[PDB]
Ligand binder design. Structure first.
Ligand SMILES: *CC(=O)N(c1ccc(C)cc1)[C@@H]1C=CS(=O)(=O)C1
Ligand SMILES: *CC(=O)N(c1ccc(C)cc1)[C@@H]1C=CS(=O)(=O)C1
Lengths: 304, 304
């Protein structure tokens, strides 16, 4: 019993973190096989960041300008290329700690673990969601760029995020491992406002199921609703609209608890309309939206 | 910017987790040098748990009854001993992944990371505090016993917790790595009620500092108070009394923010007396008490 915001074990990714230095800019890189992945803005001074031409800036760079350090040992760079907003540094040694891994571009609502690093040394791990405005609510200080987000399925690390930018509102923007930004963000020190931070409705319902499963049941009510009725309420409270796909995805938690998804929607509706009246659910005073149905099932059935 | 419930990177501890099987009971063990540490109740059937005599139960056990499996490889047990409520299994091979480590018995209010394991495989990592009633609010399913809690100082893992018991109220009890329980708990399936779950006042103030540092300042007020006055309010709301030691410990956050600890106490007092009036602090609708001053300073200054 008990329900916790839980990150994947970070070992397999700790073994991939290196320091990348170009001139006097230092940040984190990801060493997988004989390639080191890092944000392309490693080649910028903060002067450069107001309006950089990365193609022009890169022309002044050579293999030997990219200093890569795995712990204390220096890696030899035999090639560099720009892919979208990341650099790929070909090194002459395959990382012997390379896990099985994939690159995946996640959708908003999907959750992942972040290994926050400074100078290629891991400082801590925490759980995130890709927000519906394609920001993440991270914890990232100066030098944390190149820190990566990941899921682990048994032996396989799926890398979904590389950290690039803190927006002036202290939320975070970054790329998949192909260097394509999530959302409309650019690696440029400009005006970039986040859109509406909408709540991930399907994740809140998953978390309500997690609560039922763990004893917290006070918010179960006598009522039901329809997808269309629930959605009117969702709109009013800047909740993502709930689809039949969301209902389907919640089926296993439905089945296990014996609460129809549309009954749980009616419970959520009442919570949106009445607030929690000073009570808590799984030790929280608001509605948590960064547990996926998959996260709840995993944590509620002890998957490794 | 941004503030997150952050666990230590779990790699160094992932490398110490093994499966311990005695008869038909399986749980997690900690492999450090040529010793495997596990809960002594590995030798019990759940029948045994109502009123076990561990000394008598152990007499029927031999080195060869303790099956230890590190991933797929079986370790050979050349010795076993009972220390308080843990077993120490002497194996014939030192763990080549042994980090630098200490055993430390933490005090209530202190926070640590838990690597939740099943069958010696890590499932996830999360942050905890030892509560003032010597419980922790974990997330632990059947087979999670022998899971350990830890802090990391640079290269050194300080192990402070081994998971033993879920109490009937779905909170968790366990031992330091010398097998001594935190609080009055016993490895026995009996009536064991938790005491008052009091809030860790010094940790809440630390978290209020973390909030100031990160932009959330709405709860700063015009008022100050005294240790004695604040403490009257603390008593009423089941907050730990605040000592001069707590004030001293908060000095660095005081200095960095320019808010006297007694001014922040007055802010907390108003929050206790008036609630948050539907507002949030660092994305939370209640007062977080499982960040230590040391945790806030660490996360706010990018320590690795
Ligand atoms: C994002 C990041 O961590 N940094 C960074 C580097 C370069 C640019 C253009 C923006 C941001 C850190 C800033 C200075 S550093 O320590 O070299 C890395
Ligand atoms: C605590 C724990 O994880 N288990 C356990 C084992 C033995 C006793 C007496 C209590 C609790 C799990 C229960 C069954 S198991 O899978 O063998 C381990």
């Amino acid at each position: 019993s008990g329900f916790r915001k839980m990150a994947f074990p970070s070992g397999k990714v700790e073994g991939c973190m290196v320091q990348v230095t170009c001139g006097t800019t230092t940040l984190n890189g990801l060493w997988l096989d004989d390639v080191v992945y890092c944000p392309r803005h490693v080649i910028c001074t903060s002067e450069d960041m107001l309006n950089p031409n990365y193609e022009d800036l890169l022309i002044r760079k050579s293999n030997h300008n990219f200093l890569v350090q795995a712990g204390n040992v220096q890696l030899r760079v035999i090639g560099h290329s720009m892919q979208n907003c990341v650099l790929k540094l070909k090194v002459d040694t395959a990382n012997p700690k390379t896990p099985k891994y994939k690159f995946v571009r996640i959708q908003p609502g999907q959750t992942f673990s972040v290994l926050a690093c400074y100078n290629g040394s891991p400082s801590g791990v925490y759980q995130c969601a890709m927000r519906p405005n394609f920001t993440i609510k991270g914890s990232f200080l100066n030098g944390s760029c190149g820190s990566v987000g990941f899921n682990i399925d048994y032996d396989c690390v799926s890398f979904c995020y590389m950290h690039h930018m803190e927006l002036p509102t202290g939320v975070h923007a970054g790329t998949d491992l192909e260097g394509n930004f999530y959302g409309p963000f650019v690696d440029r020190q400009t005006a970039q406002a986040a859109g509406t931070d909408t709540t991930i409705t399907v994740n809140v319902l998953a978390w309500l199921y997690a609560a039922v499963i763990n004893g917290d049941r006070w918010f179960l009510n006598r009522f039901t609703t329809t997808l269309n009725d629930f959605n009117l309420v969702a709109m009013k409270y800047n909740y993502e609209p709930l689809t039949q796909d969301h209902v389907d995805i919640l089926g296993p938690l439905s089945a296990q608890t014996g609460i129809a998804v549309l009954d749980m929607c009616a419970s959520l509706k009442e919570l949106l309309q009445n607030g929690m009246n000073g009570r808590t659910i799984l030790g929280s005073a608001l509605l948590e939206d960064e547990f996926t149905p998959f996260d709840v099932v995993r944590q509620c059935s002890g998957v490794t």
